[PDB]
Structures are given as C-alpha cells and as structure tokens.
Symmetry: D5
Subunit: 174 residues, 10 copies
C-alpha cells in the first residue's frame, strides 16, 4: 500500500523510540549505533505464557556480539512501560531479569510496519531477525512465524559470515 518496507538489498529504514537499556527508559536510535552492526529481534507479545527462551538466549549470548562489532536491538510492538515491567519481573515468572539488550518498543507500530513483520489485524510483530550492516544496508531478513523460534547459533553464523566476507571483498573462496 506504501512505505515499501525494508528490503534485503537496499537500506533499512531507521528505528527510534523509548527502549529498555539496563532497566531504564532511555531513548535509542539507529544513528547511535552507526559503525557497528545491528540485529533486531521482533517478538510478538509482552508477558507471553511461553517461557521466553528465545529472547533470553541473546542476553545470555550478548558477549558474543561485542566480539563481532554489533549490538542486538530487541524490539516489540508493546508499550515501553510494559517492557520495563517485563525486564523487572524476575525469571521463572515469564521474566527477563537483567537483560543486557536494548529492548526497543515500537508501540507506535510505525517501524514493524516498515520492516514488514507486523500482522496488521493482530498488531503483533512476526518473530523476525534483521541484520543491518554498518553502511545502513539491511542484509539479512529472517522472519519466522509465531510458534517457531529463532536461534542464536544461526544469528552468529550469518553475522560472522558478513564481516569475514566484507573484509575479504565480496567472495568467499572456501
């Protein structure tokens, strides 16, 4: 209908808004991370009944991203004051105690609309993974459906495979 979303060859549309960094409502922009890579985790709903092992398995692996010159930016289309209550609720309660990831909140749904991972009649974002390299170009579009989950072992395989490639031109010999 418009916008054109975000392609895997062209530049990713920018994202901004309040976010939860280290337990606080701090404004987070895409331009704050220029020079690194950024990895978005759209995940649909807040406080969901599923023990959220998918999102925790990137806060537990956040040390693996600073080795690879990147910052994961988790994101959902729920209220930012609701994400702060979901970081602050302790685990074994459907909680995210001390999550070391900027959990964005596109409660405007202006951004998950842009990335094309929004179910419009449901308002929730499809479980999407988006790697933007430091040029500002979106480079990897992993969009799952709702019931399946993402993986950290593939989001580190592919994310390592760009910087091994883009240093060495654009061809991998082996």
């Amino acid at each position: 209908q418009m916008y054109r979303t975000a392609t895997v060859r062209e530049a990713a549309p920018q994202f901004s808004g309040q976010a939860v960094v280290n337990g606080a409502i701090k404004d987070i922009n895409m331009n704050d991370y220029k020079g690194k890579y950024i990895v978005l985790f759209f995940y649909p709903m807040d406080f969901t009944f599923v023990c959220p092992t998918e999102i925790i398995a990137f806060s537990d692996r956040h040390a693996d991203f600073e080795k690879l010159n990147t910052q994961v930016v988790a994101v959902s289309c729920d209220s930012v004051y609701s994400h702060l209550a979901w970081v602050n609720t302790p685990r074994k309660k459907g909680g995210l105690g001390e999550m070391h990831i900027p959990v964005l909140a596109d409660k405007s749904m202006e951004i998950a609309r842009d990335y094309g991972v929004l179910i419009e009649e449901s308002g929730i974002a499809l479980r999407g993974l988006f790697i933007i390299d430091k040029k500002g170009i979106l480079r990897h579009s992993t969009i799952n459906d709702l019931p399946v989950g993402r993986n950290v072992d593939e989001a580190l395989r592919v994310l390592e495979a760009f910087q091994y490639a883009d240093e060495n031109g654009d061809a991998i010999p082996c």
Copy 2:
C-alpha cells in the same frame, strides 16, 4: 483520512478482541452487551509509573454500574497478555489486583483509531470515556488529554442522566 471515527449522535463502531475478565483471556465483543450500556475507558499505557487511581476507581465502583444497567469496558492499545500481567501484579506496585472490569486490548489499534482517541505517532490512546446506549448509539464523548484524569462521579452523573431522560421521553422538566 477515512473511517469517520465515532460521533456523539450516530452509532458507535463495534469493538472486539481478547480481554481480561476476572483474570483470564476471554473474548469480549460489543454484541455480548446488547441491552445494557457500555462505558469505555481508554487509558494510554500499560504498567505506567503513575499509581493508576483513575482505572481502579471504576473497579472499586463497579457495583454502581450494575445498579444502572451498564458494563464498563476498560480498553487500552497494549497487548492482552500485558494486561493480564497488569491485573495479576498486586497493588502498591502499579498493579490492578482483582479488577472487576473487562479490560479490553485493542493491540491492533483498529478500534481506538475508530473512536478517534488514538495518538497515531505515539500509539497510545487518549484518556477517553465513551457512553454508548443500548440502541448502539454513542451518546457521550469525554476525551481528556494524557496528564489529567477522568472521574467516576461524573461518569455516574451523566450515565444516570440518560436513563432518567430516555425513560421520560427526551426532555427533563427540572
């Protein structure tokens, strides 16, 4: 741009979706309440830092509505699994322990868009009160801004003033 919103003379657009009734995700429709009146409380954000005295003061006064043949239907543009976590969190924590109101969730934002109480760039609903009489006609549009609050003493004054009037024709002599 379209829709036309909901007027105070014409029929209110219908609302539906998952909701929190008595601590459970139960589907709630406008057609389930035909014959009663319905009073919507748009309130912007979930788990907000303000001690939510505005919304609690209708669950504490829910007995005054069954005397007046009506059901209040609180509503916000946040996730329904986030409202369930906000009813379940106990009070003096920014909580709503045992709220006897169907707390809707228009996380699609298809309905607060219709009622014209949505701030589009913020995604949150303006603090709006909407009385629809049993014909399906919207009859009272109280829309505050964000920082001020609603009142139960006016939402019972006006809501009593319809049924005292619509029984006695359409004119009040005193």
Copy 3:
C-alpha cells in the same frame, strides 16, 4: 469530508464572531483570550423549553473561573441577535438575565462544524465542552448528547487538574 475537526491532542481551530458580552453585541475572538484557558459550551438551541439550568450554572459559577485563569465562552449555532434577546429576557421565562459569560454565536456554523459537535441535518450543536489550554491546544473534549446535561463540578475538576499538572511537569504523583 474535510477540515479534520478539532482533536484532543492537536491545536484547536480558532473561533470568532459577534457575541453577547454583558448584554451587548461585541466581537469576540480566540486571540483576545491568549494566556488564559477557554471553555466552550456548545448548547443546541436558543429559547428552548427546558429551563436552561445547564448554562446558568456557569454564569453563577463565573467567579470560580477567574480564580483558575480561564474564561468560559458559551456558544451556539443561533443568531447573535437572538442570543441578545435571550440574555435580555428575564428568568422564569426561559431567560438568562445578567449572564456574565461571552455567549458566542456561530450562526455561520463554520466553527461548530470544525469542532465536530454539529448535527448537520439539524443545524444544532451537540452539548459539548472544550477546554483549550493557553498554548492553543485543545485538551478536553466532553461532548454529551442533547437530553443530558454538562456539569460545573466536573468542568472545574478537570480544568483545575491541568494547571496543577502543567505547572508540575506532566505527571501527578498522587
């Protein structure tokens, strides 16, 4: 169809025209009241059979508004020479003897069209209350239907609740 009306978050459209101030046809503009707040009372018809207790109960309470840095601006879509005949007709006749409120007249119906409180096929304005703060931003949209009435005790509660809030930032702690 156009105009877009007046929202509760955006700036209110201006109003102007002849009005009844202290029993005289004096031109009254929104820009004459910049710095104060303004409270509009749309009321549908002139010389109506109902003893107009709704409108009188703001002229009797006009001292409560100069304490709160605001001027109520009553308004109807009837002729300004008809409002002057309705202020001049004495009470217990359906009259408004010595009303200390600028009673506007949008007999063009260009303004109650803008505020969205006009019934187009009837020409009369819905019983609407509109609080614009001194920035020019509409901040409270109370629109009743015809047979019910407004209240002075809520239009002083909400109007006090802005200036207590907007002095103290935008959050109320209690």
Copy 4:
C-alpha cells in the same frame, strides 16, 4: 459547487422543517400546500433591531392571499424555538404578536442553500421572495439585499399576474 439552486423556469426544491403556525411548533412541508401557490419570505436574522415592518406587512395582508389561492411561507435560517419566542414577544419590542403566517425555520440551512439566498460566511438568508406556482415550478425570484425591504404591493401584483395569465393561456393581450 453543486445543488444547482432553484431556477425561475425549473421546479423549486422542496422545503420542510418545524415552523411556527399560530404560535406552535408544527411541521410544515411544501407538499401540504399542493394546489395553492406558495410565497417564501427569506429574512436574515431573528430579533433584529429593525422594527420588522417588512414581515408584519404580510401578516397584516394575509387575507389578500387567501383571495388569490396562495399561502405565504415566511422562512429564516434561525432556530424554530427562536421564531416561537419571536412570535410570542409582543410588538413595540421587535415582536410579531399573532402573525398569521407559517414562519418556517431552516436552521439546517439546507433550503436557503438550495434557493441560493444564503450568505454562507454569515449564515443569514438574503431578503428573498419566491413564488412557486401550483405545478411545483418556481416562477418569481425577487432577492433583495439586506438593508432594503420587500413589498406587499408588488408581491400581490405579480402573484395576481400569474393566475390571470395562466388561466388565459400564457399571453396577456393588454
């Protein structure tokens, strides 16, 4: 912009609404007068400061119209409850005590818009006279401006001149 107004050769658009007949709010339609002629008096404002000799001089001459098979239908774009207060206010006060004319009220301004006698930015109707013969065809368009007045001696000359002509074909020999 649309409508096309009412021409002097084509059929006049119908008029309806509440009106003041003999001091009462009675519904008056054009179809109630089929077979007679109808003579409209648009006059701009209600309770105007001018001693309304223009409108009174047709209630004083209403016997001259039942001799000529016609009913004058005075009309203004003011509220019908305001016309009832203007018939009920006695003369030498800017009043119309016992006016034997159906004083219409197009407070919707849907009809004086159709007849093209409405000043849109002022909302008031130009001082217009409209003779529709019993076929439903508008036949005489006298539209003055505001400060000048109409006449009963011409609105009886022309109105007699139709029925003397339309009985005798369409040509007057002398």
Copy 5:
C-alpha cells in the same frame, strides 16, 4: 456547471456589447456607468406579439432614474441589428419609437448566461431585473417568469431604498 452566475451579495459580472442608444449601434460597457447604478431589464424575445408595455414603461419613466443617479440598461439575447429595427419600428405595431434606454444585445448569450436568467434550450432570457450599486455589487435580483411582467413602481421603490439606506449607514430606523 461553471461561471457561478451573479449573486445578490457578490459583485455582478460585467456586461458589454453593441447596443441601441438613441437609435444607433453604439458600444456600451458596464465601466461606462461606474458611479451610477445600473438596472438591467432582461426581456426574452424581440418583436414579440405582446404589446411591450413592460419595456416602454421604463422609457416613459427614464426621467425618474436620472433623479436617482442610475441608468437602466435594457438587454435581450437577440441581434443588435434586430433591436435597432425594433426601436425604429413605430408603436401600435409592436414597436419602441424613441426609447431613451440603452437597449443592449447579448446575442453571444455570454452575459445572460452569467446572470442565470437564460433558458438554455430556448435561448431567451427570463424577464429579469438586476440592480447593481456603484461599487459593482449586484444588490437586487428580480427574476420573473415569461408571461408575467415587471413593474416600474417597484423598481423605483427598491432602487430608492438603497440610496436612502447606503447614505444612512446600513440600517433604516423607520
């Protein structure tokens, strides 16, 4: 369809073309009469079978217009060489011998189209009277149908009533 015609509140569209002044084809424009008033007599057809008492009764009364600072401008949608043959044909033959009025000819029908007095399928102008005051504003729209006639006693009453009013402001006290 366009043009918008000429209203009774707005400025009248200009008229020009060849005309019969004192028995000669002389060009006559609206701008030649600025400062006076102008009174148009649309009359439908030339050399009509009716003894044209309507048009003669303004040439016989042309002295009454120079007392009132105005020039009547008779006009028809027939050829200007046909009007000259109709002034030159003597009376008791359907003639207008020595008519002291500029008889215009809008044989283009560009002007009676503008004034809205043209029957398009017949090409003839409705019997219309139009008073434009010296500002260029059309101020009186008397449009009869074909078989009835105009009057000089009303076109002098109304035309005197402007200049008595516009000298004395815009209100007539008696």
Copy 6:
C-alpha cells in the same frame, strides 16, 4: 470541445424549432423533409444594413428547387419573432416580402453550434450552405465568411450534380 459538429461524410445532426413558413410561426423539423434534399442557408444577423440580396436570390429561385426534389431551409440564430418581422417588412427597407422559404430560427444556437458555423463570441452564424441528401447524410459544406456571399448558381450546380450522380451509381463518366 464536444458534439463533433456535422461532417461532410457522416450524417447531419437534426434541426428543429419554430420557423417562418409563408408568413407564420410554424414548427419545422428535418424529419418533415425526409425523401427530399435540404439546403440550409445560415446567415448571420437579422435586419442587417446590407440589402439582403443573398437570401432573396433563393426565394426568387425557389421554383428551381422543386424541380430538383429539395427544399431550402434558411436559418439564422435570431429570434423567430424577429424573422417574422423581417419577412413582414417590405423590400427597399431591408425586407423579405413574401419569401417562399422556411426561414428557421435557432435562437437556442444549439444547431448552428452543431454545424460548426457559429461564431461563439459573436453569436452569429457564418454564411454557410449545407446540402443533406435524402439518406440524412450531409454532403456539401460551403461555409463562407461574413462579408462575402453565397450563390444560387453554384448551389444549383452542386445540388444537381448529386442526383445526376447518385442515380448513376457514384461515378460520372464525363
């Protein structure tokens, strides 16, 4: 702009209206002459200063057309009551005493608009000659300008040349 006018290969648009036949206002249609040919003489103005030798030279030659199975239909965009006054005015006065041609009058200018011989800003028809054969097909378009004239010797040469040809197929051997 529309209509498409009348071509010399396609069918001529029909013409109708009041006309002067033998000194009387009789309705004349194209369908009244089906089976004959018809020859139109558009001529611009009525009662023109030129001694109208162009039009008279077809009434003087009207016997030559009944030999050739055709009826000339003279036509102008002036009033039909003006043509009757121009047939009735005697010659050596710019007259047409006893003209044996149906002198049409398209005072609507709906037909000379169709044939494309109308000067729109002047309202007068170009001096046009139009031969329609009995199929209803326009077959000859002679359109002069204003100051030059037509001819009877060519309008009989060409008009004879159709029926000599259309009897003998469509080719002339000599």
Copy 7:
C-alpha cells in the same frame, strides 16, 4: 479528438511538404506565399479513373489567379512521387500534362487531418476548397463530397469577392 481542425473565422493551420511545381519535387510551404491568397484543392485519389476535369480546370485557369493576387495549391493525400508520375503522364490517359499549379502531397496526412477534409478509414481527402486570405485567416470552406466536383467559376467569384470587400472595408453596398 484534438487539433480542432481549421475554422472559417480563425487562422488556417500551416501546410508543408514536397510538391510538384512545373514537373519537379520542390518543397512548398505556406510561408512562401505570404501576401498572396492561397486556394487549396483537396482531391481524394491519384490516377483515378475519372478524367480529372475538376483539377485541370484550374491549371487551365491559372492566369485568372495571378490577376487576383493568389496561388492555388492543389493537394492530395498521396505520395509526392506519385503526383510527379501523374503530372508526367500525358492527357487522354488520366493525366495532367503541364499543370501550372503546385500539387502538394500530404502523404503524412497531417494536414488534411487538420483541415477536417480527411476520411480517416479511407485515407483520402474530401474534395475541399479552402481560401486563406493574406493575413493567414481561413476564409472560405467549400467541402464537397467525393462524386460531385468543384467549380472554377465559383472559386473565382468568391475569391474576387473578398478583395473587392476587404479593400472597401467589410461591407458591400450593392
């Protein structure tokens, strides 16, 4: 559909292209003849079976045009190399031996499209005669159909009648 063709009051559209002058393919433009008049002879087809007496009767009369300050410009929608073969073929063979007329060729059919004498589905030009005076204004539109022919005695009568008139103003007294 567009273009607007060439009228008899407005300026004629220009014509250009290769032509046959004195047996040679020479470029001929309208601007080469400015100051003279130009007379076009559209004729439909080349090498037609009819002994082309219509076109020859202007080459035989070409001396009569240099007396009248004009150049006839014959024209057809056939190839210019086909016109050269039709001038070069001798007479009594359907030929035009030594034709002293610039025989144009609008084989583009861009010009007979402009003059409105083209039968589009047949591609051939209607037998048209067009007199443009030296101002560039088309002044005479004689368009026959196919089987009938033009005349030199009328194309000299009318062409003399312009210059006798346009020297002596625009009116012919006799």
Copy 8:
C-alpha cells in the same frame, strides 16, 4: 500509444483493403489466405525513382512460393488506384508490368500502423517483411530501413525453415 503493433510471437493483426491482383482492383483479405502462409512486403513509396528491383524480384520468384504453400502480399501506403497505374506502366519506366503478386494498398495507413513499420511524419512504410504462418501467428519480422533492400534468397530460406521445422515438431536436429 496504443494498438500494440504486431509481435513476432503473438498473432498478427489482420489486413484488408483494395489491392491489385493481375491488373485489377480486387478486394483482398487475410482470411482469404487462411491455410497458406503470407509474406508482406511493405515498401515505402509508389513510382519511386529507384528501379524497383526489390519488388520485381518477388514477382519473378512467385513460382517459388506456390511450391512452399504461401502467397506473398505486397503492400504500400499509397492509393490503390496509384498501384494500378504502377502495375500498368511498363518496365524501364519505373514500372511493374505483369506483377503476379497481390499488391495491397493501405492508403488508410491503419495496417502499416499496426505492424509498426510506418514512419508517421513521412506516411511511408519501412521496407518490412512479415511472415505469418497458417495459424495466424506472425513469425518473422524483417524490417529494413529505406535505402537498403530486402532479399528473395533469405525470404525463401526462412520461409522454408518454418515448414521444415513445424512439420518436424519445433526442433531442428542438424
């Protein structure tokens, strides 16, 4: 701009009109040749100065086409009466004496417009060759420019190569 022309994979648009078959104006249609193949020779101009060896070299080779189940259909955008004069003019004069090919004439230029071989501003067809197989599908589009020529040795090579192929499926093994 429209039409879409004729492609080399899709069906060729039909062609019709008068043509020269064996020295006579006989109507020739595409549907008369259904079951054979058809080979069009657009050639630009008639009676051109070039000794037309290109077109003659298919009438001299017309026996080679009846061996290959096809009829060449030469075609030009000149008049059909001009082609008949060009077949009838003897050779060593730029002639085509006894040409055994149906020489079409699209003097309407409706068909060379369809095939896309028309130079619109020149009206002449580009030297085009078009092989339509018996299904009605255009199968070979050889379009030269003007000064170069076609060939019979390639228009027999390709035309043999279809029927050798379409008999043996659609693949040629050697």
Copy 9:
C-alpha cells in the same frame, strides 16, 4: 508497485516452470507437492565462481527432508537448460553432479519477483530460503544477501520446529 510479494503470515504465491529433477527437464509445480512442506533455495547465478557448497549441502542432506515430510525446491533465475548443464558438469569444476533436488528455473523471473528476493537491476535472486507449510501458507522467510550463505542446520531446526508445534497446537511448552 504491485503483486504484494509473499508474506510470512499469508499464503505463498505458486511457482511453476521447467526444472531439473534427476538430470532431466521435467515440469514441476507447487501443486505437485501438496501435503508436504516445500523449502525454496533462491540462489543468484548459475556456474558461479564460488564452489557452491551452499546448494550441495542440501543435496547431501536430502535424506533429512524425507524424514521431515518435505521437499526442498531449489530455484534460480537462470535458464533451465543452463541448470541442466550445471547439474551435468562434474564437481571440482563448479558443478552439481547427481543433485537430488528439483532445481527450478524461474527464467521468466515472475516468481522470484513475487517472493521479493529479486534484485531487479541485476536480475539475480537474493539467497533466500522459504518454508511453506502444507496449508499453502508461507511460514519462514530467510533472505540473506549475496556473499553470505544459508545453512542446513538452521533450515532443519526451524523446519522441525513447525511440525513439532503444529501437531501440538500452536504453543511450545519448553
């Protein structure tokens, strides 16, 4: 611009065309695999210089897909006769000797246009992975860029995670 591509919640657009199954050009449709799942591997170019370990690592793992009720359908926007030459060329030459995957060919580029993995100015498909479940709903959109590669260990993790989930409702408890 249109199409709308293929979403991760809605139904995937169908794909068809010639393909390489077991070394032969066999037609392969989406409807041939209804009941299974289908996994597409868009890969950009044929015979690329990179030793194509990405595509081989699904033919080597094709036994793991028949255990999971699915058929991988590799696809590229190159010619199907070029894929057959790339399966037939042996390995250590940039070859795919005995690839047990239907290698599609959307050389029309109508399908990789639909799935949104086509670089339009380059014509090559982005390295995309697409899991459609047996309802026909696209369920997983992994789109890499060109230089990085896909993985079989994630395309088996996610593909197992649907059927473990869709058997057990839509929620995974652990």
Copy 10:
C-alpha cells in the same frame, strides 16, 4: 505498456552489462563501439540442446565484420557466468570453444525488454538481429521466432548495403 521499445527509424536504446570477450567477464557498453556498427544476436537460451550452428556461424565469420567496420554483439537473457561456462565448454558438447564475439548477458532483461524481442512469460529472447549504424540509429530489425534460425549471408548482405548506400547519399542507382 511503456519504454516504447526500439524502432527501425529512431535511435536504438543503449545496452550494457557484463559480457564474455575472449573468455573473460569484461564490461561491454554500446558507447565502447561508437563509430562502428553493431549487430546484436538475441538468442533465447543457454546450453540448449540444439547444436548452436546459428551463433557459431558468426564467430566463424567474424573476420567478415572487421572488413565492414562493425562488431557483432551476441546477447542473451541468461547469466553472464553461464555464458562463460558456455564459451568454455568445448564443441560437440553444445559448446562455443573460442568464440570471437562479445557475448553479452542481459540477465536483468532490461535490454531485450527494450528491443521488444523478449517473451515475457518465458523470459527468453526471440532470435533477433539488430543493426545499429554509427549514428546510434537502429536500422535493421530481423526478429525470427524460436525454431528457425538467422543467417550470416543476409546479415552481411544488408550490413554491406547500408555503408554502400550511406556513403553514396541515400539512393542506390542500380
């Protein structure tokens, strides 16, 4: 739908992209060959089962083009890495060993779309030959269908026939 393709009279649209020159992926543009002529060979598919005698018969005849100041530019809508594998595969295998022609690759299909030789639903180019002279003007459009082939003996006949003609003006005398 747009583009307009490439005509045989107008300028050919430019072509660019990677190509196979002497066994290497070298960028080839139309502007690199300005001053020569260029001859394109669209051929549909790569590695086709037909022993490609059509394309080889221009690499075997490439010496005949440098005598005629031209460079053939073979082109197909297949991948450029697939053409390199098709030059490198030796003959009697469907190969093109040591082809001395720049084999272009419009794998974008932006150029065979422009030249109008693309079958859109098949993606393959029709077997087309295109001679552009050194002005940049397309001058010869030979488009065969798929199963038939081109010829070198005609693509040297026509290509010699331009430069013999364009040196000697534009007419060939013999």
